Amino acid sequence: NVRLTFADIELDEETHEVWKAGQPVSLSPTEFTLLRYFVINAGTVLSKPKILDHVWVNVVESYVSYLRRKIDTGEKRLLHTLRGVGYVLREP
């Protein structure tokens, strides 16, 4: 998917460029892989071991946190936690 998108998040797999609300965002390779995994699986609740398996437990929490800081600090939050099940990318 040349351009890949969900809501107002945009990724370019060839350049590894990312935008949120039209503004560029600099991600490390792991952060990009992680965001891509959420976006391709938008709306699906993803456990930590599942994320760990596909992107590579505490490292998952760390990188979800890093990613949230770069891409999810606006009024409407797209990356959500639901305890004991995992994380989900979805509109409120």
Q: How many CA atoms lie within 13 A of 77 on its CB side?
A: 9
21 binds, among a second copy, K ion, Cl ion, none (CB under 5 to 8 A by kind): a second copy
Closest Cα partner for 37 from 1, 85, 73? Answer: 1
Segment 27-56, which members bind Cl ion (CB under 5 A)? Answer: 56
Alpha-helix residue ranges (DSSP H) falling in 1-92? 29-40, 48-55, 58-71
Nearest CB to a second copy, comparing residues 2 and 84 = 2
Each residue 19-58 as x (binds a second copy by CB under 8 A) or -, in order, gives x-xxxx-xxxxxx----------x-------------xxx
Binds a second copy (CB under 8 A): choice among 49, 52, 76, 81: 76
Q: Which residues pair with 4 in a beta bridge?
A: 11
Between CA 10 and CA 43, with CA 84 as vertex, the angle to 5 degrees is 30
- Which residues lie near K ion (CB under 5 A)? 1, 3
- Which residues lie near Cl ion (CB under 5 A)? 1, 5, 56
